C-alpha cells in the first residue's frame, strides 16, 4: 500500500516535473527515485483483474534507465519518459481497480489482490517515497 502510493506519487511528479526545457536541478532528485523504481520493478511479472468483467492483464517490466546527463531536458528525454510513465500509469490504474473491487470479512486491512500482495514484499520496499496525502 505504501509502495503503491509511492509509485503513484512518482508518476504524478514525473508527469509534472519532467517537462520540456526544464532545468535538470529541478528534477535531479526525482530521476534518481524513478530510476530506483525502474531498477526495482524490472524482472517482475504481475497479473491484474479476474473478477466480474474486469479483464485479466499480464504486466512485464523491461525498461531502460533514464539519462542523468542533460542540463535542460530536451524533447527526446520527455518522449521516452512519457512512454515509461504511460506504461506504469496503466499498470497502477489496473492494480488500483483490482484492489478496490475486492474485500474480505476476515482481515480487510490486508491487501487482497495478487499484485498488491506481491508489492508488499521488502524487495519492493525501496520504491517507497514521501507519504504526504
Amino acid at each position: 500500500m505504501d509502495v503503491l502510493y509511492s509509485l503513484s506519487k512518482t508518476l504524478k511528479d514525473a508527469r509534472d516535473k519532467i517537462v520540456e526545457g526544464t532545468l535538470y536541478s529541478n528534477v535531479s532528485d526525482l530521476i534518481q527515485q524513478f530510476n530506483q523504481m525502474i531498477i526495482t520493478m524490472n524482472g517482475n511479472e504481475f497479473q491484474t483483474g479476474g473478477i466480474g468483467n474486469l479483464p485479466i492483464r499480464n504486466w512485464n517490466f523491461n525498461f531502460g534507465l533514464l539519462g542523468t546527463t542533460l542540463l535542460n531536458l530536451d524533447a527526446n528525454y520527455v518522449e521516452t519518459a512519457r512512454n515509461t510513465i504511460d506504461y506504469f500509469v496503466d499498470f497502477v490504474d489496473n492494480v488500483c481497480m483490482d484492489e478496490m473491487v475486492r474485500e474480505s470479512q476476515r482481515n480487510g486491512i490486508a491487501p487482497q489482490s495478487d499484485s498488491l500482495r506481491k508489492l508488499s514484499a521488502i524487495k519492493f520496499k525501496r520504491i517507497n517515497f514521501d507519504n504526504s496525502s
Binding site: 535538470y24 536541478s25 542523468t68 546527463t69 542533460l70 542540463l71 535542460n72
Partner: protein, 781 residues
C-alpha cells in the same frame, strides 16, 4: 618487474585432462589359514578382503586425519576421463581369450585359477569373464573384481565423467558472441571434427568469493595483472603523422617569438610518437581491467588542460582518483573557462562534495560550455550483463564520436569571449590552444570512435565481472601523452588482429577456469575438514596453498588475517557436486575402511566376569567383541584431550565393568598358558601409575592349532575364557562371483584442448573497418 607480472599470467597452462590408468582399489584379496569349530585347522585357505596397505595410526584424530589424506588422494586420482580399453589386459584362461579390466584383476583371476581348492563352480566363472563390445553404440564392458566400496568409487569415476561431444558448431559457439556477429572478422575452418571427439569445457562460473568486496590488496594484484595483460593486447598505432612534421605545423599555428618568454613554447613539450601509443594502450587497458588512473600534468602547460578536456569528454570521471581529477578540473576551470566570462578565480575548498565541474555547471551563464560541463559531470558507464559477464559499457554518444562535436561547439564559445579582466597576450594564449585543438575536429571524432571500438572488441574477450571499484595503488597517466595522442593520429585504422583477440580470450579463460577449479578444491578440503571434526587443524595451510597455486599472488606478503578471512568466506560456498559425491562415499564407507584392518582396535571392553572366547573360522578363538552394548563407554580421545584421568582411575582402582572406546593397537598373543596366566588385566595398571593412555596396548588372542601347546583346549573340554575383550570387526570373505562387476564405458574417443586452434581467422581491411552503427571508424580523408 612489469614483464614478470606478465609472465605469471601468460603461463597459466590450463588443467591437464587426467586419464585413469589404474582402478583405485583400497582392498585386496588375501588368503588366510582357516580353523575348525574347535581351533583345529580346516585343510583349506580362504581368500578375504584386507587393506592393500595401512597407515591407520592410533589416535582417532590421526585416524580422521588419515581419511582426509585419503580424500585428497581420491581427489588427486579423480579421472577427468577414462578409456577402459587402455587399461584392460587379458586373463590367461578364458574360453574366448577375453580381457579383464586390470592387471590386478588378472592377477586375482590367475590366483583363483591354478589354486588347489578354488572349487569348480568358480573356475567355470573365470572362463566366462569376457569383454562385451557394442561398436554401434560405442559402449564396451570389461569384467572387474572390485570391493563394493571400491566399486562405488569406480562406478562413480565411470558415470560422472567430464567429456562432452564436439563438432564445428560448438567451436562456432566457443568464440564469444560480440566477435561472432562482428562484420569486421571472418572465421573459417579446415577440419570436420568426427562423431567421436570430446573436450572438457572450462569452469566459467563467476566470482563466488567477491574479492572486490574487502580484499583490496589481493584485487589490487588482480587488476595489476589484468592491466599488464590488456596492455600487451591493445594494438600499436599504425601510420601516425610525422612527429617532426607536426611540431613544425604546431609551431606555425602559434607564432613562436624567439625573444619573448611566453606560455606557448611549453605547449610543444613531450609530444612524441611513443607517448602516443603509450597513452592509447593505457587508456584502453586501464578501462578493460577496471583499474583507476591518476593524472600527471604541469599547470602552466595549457595544451595539457585542453587535452584533459578531451580526456574528460571521452572517459568517465569515475576512472580516476578524486585528487588528480579534481585538481585537473580545477586547473582547466580556473585557466580557460572562468576568465572567459570575467568571473572569480573560485577559491575551491579541498573536500567539497561537488567537483569544480559540478559547480561550474551552475555558475556559468552560457548554455554550450555548461552543456558540455554537464555531460562530463554525470558521465558514467552503464552496468551491463551480456553473455553472462559484466561489461561496463560506455555511453552511445561517446562511442559515436558525437560528443567531440558537443565539445567543440562548446569550445568555439570560449574563443568568442573577450576575456574582460585578462590581458590580450593571455587571450592569444588561450585561443591559440583552442585553435590548436579545433584544427583536429574530425581527427578527434575518429580517435574517439577508434578508442571506443577497440574498447568494445577487447572487452568482448573478458570472462570475469568488470567490477568497478576504485583500486588501491592507481597507476600513472600523463597528459603530455594525451596531448601527443590528440595530435598524431592521422588516417590509418588499427583494430586488434583476431589472433591477439583469441590469445587474450584464451589467457582470460585459462586464468578464470584455474581460479574456479582452485576454489572448488579448497572449498572441498575445508568442508571435508569441518564435517569430520578436525578441531586441531589450523587452516592457514589450505588457503596459503590456495594462493600458492594461483600463480599471481605474492603469498609471503599476505599475512594471517586475509588468509583466515578467505577461510571465513570460502566455507560459505557449496561444494561442487563431484567432490560432494566423493565426500559422501568417503563419509559412508570411512567407518568400514577404519574397522577393516589389523594394527587398529576400536575399543577394549574390560568386564571382570569370565567371558568365553568366541570362535570364528580365521582365528580359532578370539576375545573379539562386536558391539559396545551393555557397557559404560568412555571415549579415549576426548580423555586424552582434557587429560582428566579421574573417572577411569576411579573405575580401574575398584573393579567396575568399563569400555574404553577409541582406536588402539594390540599385540597378538597366541599361547594358551599366557591366557591361563591372566594377562588380560595386566596392561591397564600403567594408566593409573603414569597418567597417559598413548602407551595403552591391549591384547587379542589367537588360540589355534598352529599355536604352541593347544592340547589344553583339545584334551580337557575347555571352551576358552578371558577377562577382557578387545573390540575388532571380523574380515569379510572374498565371494568371487559377487565381487565381480562389469565396468561400462565408451570404446574410442579423442580429447581436444585448444578449441581455437581449428579456427582460421581474418579481418576486413581497416580502410573499410566498420563500427556498431554500420559506419566506418576513421572515415577521415
Amino acid at each position: 618487474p612489469k614483464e614478470s607480472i606478465l609472465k605469471k599470467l601468460e603461463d597459466i597452462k590450463p588443467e591437464q585432462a587426467k586419464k585413469q590408468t589404474k582402478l583405485f582399489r583400497i582392498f585386496e584379496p588375501k588368503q588366510l589359514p582357516i580353523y575348525r569349530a574347535n581351533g583345529e585347522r580346516e585343510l583349506r585357505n580362504r581368500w578375504y578382503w584386507k587393506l592393500k596397505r595401512d597407515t591407520l595410526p592410533d589416535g582417532d584424530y590421526d585416524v580422521r586425519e588419515y581419511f582426509l589424506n585419503l580424500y585428497d588422494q581420491v581427489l588427486m586420482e579423480m579421472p577427468d576421463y577414462l578409456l577402459l580399453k587402455d587399461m584392460a589386459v587379458e586373463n590367461k584362461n578364458s574360453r574366448d581369450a577375453g580381457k579383464v579390466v586390470d592387471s590386478e584383476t588378472a592377477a586375482i583371476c590367475d590366483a583363483i585359477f591354478q589354486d588347489e581348492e578354488t572349487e569348480g563352480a568358480v573356475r567355470r566363472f573365470i572362463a566366462e569373464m569376457r569383454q562385451r563390445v557394442q561398436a554401434d553404440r560405442n559402449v564396451v564392458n570389461y569384467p572387474s573384481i572390485l570391493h563394493p566400496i571400491d566399486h562405488a568409487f569406480n562406478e562413480y569415476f565411470l558415470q560422472h565423467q567430464l567429456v562432452e561431444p564436439l563438432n564445428n558448431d560448438i567451436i562456432f559457439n566457443y568464440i564469444p558472441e560480440r566477435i561472432r556477429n562482428d562484420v569486421n572478422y571472418i572465421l573459417n575452418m579446415d577440419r570436420n571434427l568426427p562423431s567421436t571427439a570430446r573436450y572438457i569445457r572450462p569452469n566459467l562460473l563467476q566470482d563466488r568469493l567477491n574479492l572486490h568486496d574487502n580484499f583490496e590488496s589481493l584485487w589490487d594484484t588482480i587488476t595489476t595483472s589484468n592491466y599488464i595483460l590488456a596492455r600487451s593486447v591493445v594494438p600499436d598505432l599504425k601510420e601516425l603523422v610525422s612527429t617532426e612534421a607536426q611540431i613544425q605545423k604546431m609551431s606555425q599555428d602559434l607564432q613562436l617569438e624567439a625573444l619573448t618568454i611566453q606560455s606557448e613554447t611549453q605547449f610543444l613539450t613531450g609530444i612524441n610518437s611513443q607517448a602516443a601509443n603509450d597513452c592509447f594502450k593505457t587508456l584502453i587497458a586501464a578501462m578493460l581491467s577496471q583499474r583507476t588512473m591518476s593524472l600527471d600534468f604541469v599547470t602552466t602547460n595549457y595544451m595539457s588542460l585542453i587535452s584533459g578536456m578531451w580526456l574528460l569528454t571521452v572517459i568517465p570521471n569515475d576512472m580516476f582518483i578524486r585528487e588528480s581529477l579534481v585538481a585537473c578540473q580545477l586547473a582547466i576551470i580556473n585557466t580557460i573557462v572562468y576568465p572567459a566570462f570575467g568571473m572569480q578565480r573560485m577559491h575551491y575548498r579541498n573536500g567539497d562534495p561537488q567537483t569544480p565541474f559540478q559547480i561550474a555547471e551552475q555558475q556559468i551563464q552560457n548554455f554550450q560550455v555548461a552543456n558540455w560541463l554537464h555531460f562530463v559531470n554525470y558521465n558514467q558507464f552503464r552496468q551491463v550483463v551480456i553473455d553472462g559477464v559484466l561489461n561496463q559499457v560506455l555511453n552511445d554518444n561517446i562511442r559515436n564520436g558525437h560528443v567531440v562535436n558537443q565539445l567543440m561547439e562548446a569550445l568555439m564559445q570560449l574563443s568568442r569571449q573577450q576575456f574582460p579582466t585578462m590581458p590580450v597576450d593571455y587571450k592569444r594564449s588561450i585561443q591559440r590552444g583552442i585553435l590548436l585543438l579545433s584544427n583536429r575536429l574530425g581527427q578527434l571524432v575518429d580517435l574517439t570512435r577508434l578508442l571506443s571500438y577497440n574498447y568494445e572488441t577487447l572487452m568482448a574477450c573478458i570472462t570475469m565481472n568488470m567490477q568497478h571499484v576504485q583500486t588501491l595503488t592507481t597507476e600513472k597517466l600523463q597528459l603530455t601523452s594525451v596531448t601527443s595522442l590528440c595530435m598524431l593520429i592521422g588516417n590509418a585504422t588499427v583494430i586488434p588482429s583476431p589472433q591477439t583477440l583469441f590469445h587474450y580470450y584464451n589467457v582470460n579463460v585459462n586464468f578464470h577456469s584455474n581460479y574456479n577449479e582452485r576454489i572448488n578444491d579448497a572449498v572441498a578440503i575445508i568442508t571435508a575438514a569441518n564435517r569430520l571434526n578436525l578441531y586441531q587443524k589450523k587452516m592457514k595451510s589450505i588457503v596459503e596453498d590456495f594462493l600458492k597455486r594461483l600463480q599471481i599472488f605474492d603469498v609471503a606478503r599476505v599475512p594471517d588475517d586475509q588468509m583466515y578471512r578467505l577461510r571465513d568466506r570460502l566455507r560459505l560456498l557449496p561444494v561442487e557436486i563431484r567432490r560432494l559425491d566423493i565426500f559422501n562415499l568417503i563419509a559412508m564407507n570411512m567407518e568400514q575402511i577404519e574397522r577393516a584392518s589389523d594394527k587398529i582396535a576400536q575399543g577394549v571392553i574390560i568386564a571382570y566376569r569370565d567371558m568365553q572366547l568366541e570362535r570364528d573360522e580365521m582365528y580359532g578363538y578370539v576375545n573379539i567383541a562386536r558391539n559396545l552394548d551393555g557397557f559404560q563407554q568412555i571415549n579415549l580421545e576426548e580423555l586424552m584431550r582434557s587429560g582428566d584421568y579421574a573417572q577411569i582411575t576411579n573405575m580401574l582402582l575398584n573393579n567396575q565393568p568399563v569400555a574404553l572406546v577409541g582406536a588402539l593397537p594390540f599385540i597378538t598373543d597366541s599361547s594358551v598358558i599366557s591366557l591361563i596366566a591372566k594377562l588380560d588385566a595386566t596392561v591397564f595398571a600403567q594408566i593409573v601409575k603414569l597418567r597417559k593412555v598413548d602407551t595403552l596396548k591391549p591384547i587379542l588372542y589367537k588360540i589355534n592349532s598352529d599355536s604352541n601347546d593347544f592340547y589344553l583346549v583339545a584334551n580337557y573340554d575347555w571352551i576358552p575364557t578371558s577377562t577382557t575383550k578387545v573390540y575388532k570387526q571380523v574380515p569379510q570373505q572374498f565371494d568371487f562371483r559377487a565381487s565381480m562387476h562389469m565396468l561400462t564405458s565408451n570404446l574410442t574417443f579423442t580429447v581436444y584442448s585448444d578449441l581455437l586452434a581449428f579456427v582460421s581467422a581474418d579481418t576486413v581491411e581497416p580502410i573499410n573497418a566498420v563500427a556498431f552503427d554500420n559506419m566506418r571508424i576513421m572515415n577521415e580523408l
